[PDB]
Amino acid sequence: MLKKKQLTVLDLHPGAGKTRRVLPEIVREAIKKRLRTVILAPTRVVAAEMEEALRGLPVRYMTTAVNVTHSGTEIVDLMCHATFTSRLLQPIRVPNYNLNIMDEAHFTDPSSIAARGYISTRVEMGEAAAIFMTATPPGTRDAFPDSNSPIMDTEVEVPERAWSSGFDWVTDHSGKTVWFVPSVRNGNEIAACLTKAGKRVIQLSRKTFETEFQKTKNQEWDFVITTDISEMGANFKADRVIDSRRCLKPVILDGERVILAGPMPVTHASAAQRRGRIGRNPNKPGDEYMYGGGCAETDEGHAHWLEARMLLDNIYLQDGLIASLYRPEADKVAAIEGEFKLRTEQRKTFVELMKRGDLPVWLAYQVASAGITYTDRRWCFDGTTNNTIMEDSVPAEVWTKYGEKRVLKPRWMDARVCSDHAALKSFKEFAAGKR
Ligand SMILES: CC(=O)Nc1ccccc1CC(=O)O
Fold first, then answer.
1. 63 Cβ below 6 A of ligand 1
2. Annotated binding residue 421
């Protein structure tokens, strides 16, 4: 695995011990061979789990999720997928890692896709080795992979709204259930209906995941209601998964706006990861997977692959060369390598709009490529009437940095900035000049 020019896909089934057994073996071999190594965790939660699995090995934890300060002598770095891509974009030295390990390497957030592109390009160039750890490599067609224990798979209608009757199987269960919903708003309605029926519910989404995930250990619960973020190595003591088999797809229309299309079917990889939350204990056979729809390859034309190209066009590789997407996922977007390469000052703007601005990649790119500076928020207010953002069926309003009340009407509309109350609150704060 550890030889230059090799990319290994460690595609053991879910719970086969890729993180807890195989990763520490790889790290011990890497240190023996003096390979400068990076380990990429999808989340802070997984970063903390890795520290436990690697405890006592010389690993630098480039994350505040782990309260160990680096001794200085480590040649193994551990950071999140997003942190890797972020450091590549910033005017900060990232070492030439000889060995690049990505855990949960199926993660389809733009920074993860970009990280795979950069790493796989380095391996193709003969510069490095890589290991991508995932039960579900890109374009897997198998939603029902092997498990540590037999799973009971049932195709069943799954509610996506509050229900009064017709779904007794949902609440008649005594065990713990992980329920995958297509969106935060959809989870909120299901969570409220379960709470009304006397159930204890924890909700997880990207913005809440570190804080809320701790509740699954610290409090008793009957249901976890989660978006797709729990596909990225989130482990639960559960005996049932309920899977809507639905997700939202960000889609760029006419190069000019992003909508959240769907809900629509998940990929086979997503379905397999959702199911793979259960069947993990060889001593507890007959965990249940209830699924409410089919799969489809809805990553085709999904904005995250175009966003990954926008990141990779803006990462230095060598002279004017630009990293390609990892070959198995490179057809998910129709893009020209280099089309989104920005001049130095616009690139800096692009980076800050993502890092400090917390804007989606696509929207950051529109603003930076227009020659707008990071603090210039006029574009938040000067869009067409149909770009008006609504809050409880009235236009959303903010006080501008000038102290004027204005309707929020961005020049470029990206539905992710108002997908839920928390998103819209953040975007209002941005439009107001508050970060
Ligand atoms: C603070 C620490 O002990 N390790 C480390 C080393 C190098 C760069 C950044 C970090 C921390 C971080 O990225 O949060």
1. yes
2. no
